[PDB]
Amino acid sequence: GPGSMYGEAVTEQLSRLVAGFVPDAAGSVDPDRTLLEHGIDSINLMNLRFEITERFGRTLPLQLLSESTVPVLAAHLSADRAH
Ligand SMILES: *P(=O)(O)OCC(C)(C)[C@@H](O)C(=O)NCCC(=O)NCCS
């Protein structure tokens, strides 16, 4: 009808989080590359895993985190509604 509500996106919330864990001179994460392509070491993948646990109530293995991109990880987190 005349009223509408757009809502927030999980891909943005994980994107701006992962942009805080890239160890290279990169200023932001590229969505078409993996966390292993950004070169994120196990310590920072475990810090990302803990932040995702606190923010979404979800936990994922380092073997998935290294092989996955930002949209692929966001699709696993977005598998149930929270709003
Ligand atoms: P990364 O997985 O290369 O780990 C580097 C480390 C400095 C944290 C090192 O102490 C280590 O090998 N820890 C064990 C990491 C682990 O068990 N990961 C889960 C399987 S990918």
Task: Locate 36 and state its tokens.
Answer: 């292993």
Closest CA to 23 of 7, 6, 42, 4: 42
Residue 43 Cα distances to 17, 27, 32, 37, 83, angstroms? 15, 19, 23, 16, 31
User: CB count, 10 Å around CB of 3?
Assistant: 4
One-letter amino acid at 13 equals Q
3-class SS string, 25-73: CCCCCCCCCECCCCCCCHHHHHHHHHHHHHHHCCCCCHHHHHHCEHHHH
Joined tokens for residue 52: 């995702």
The finding on whether 39 has its CB within 6 A of some atom of ligand 1 is no
Distance, CA of 2 to CA of 23 (rounded, Å):
47
φ, ψ dihedrals at 67, nearest 5°: -80, -20
* Ligand 1 nearest-atom number relative to CA 43: 8
Looking up tokens 């070169």, which residue turns up?
39
**Does 62 sit in the ligand 1 pocket, CB within 6 Å?**
yes
| CA–CA dist 56, 82 (Å, integer) | 8
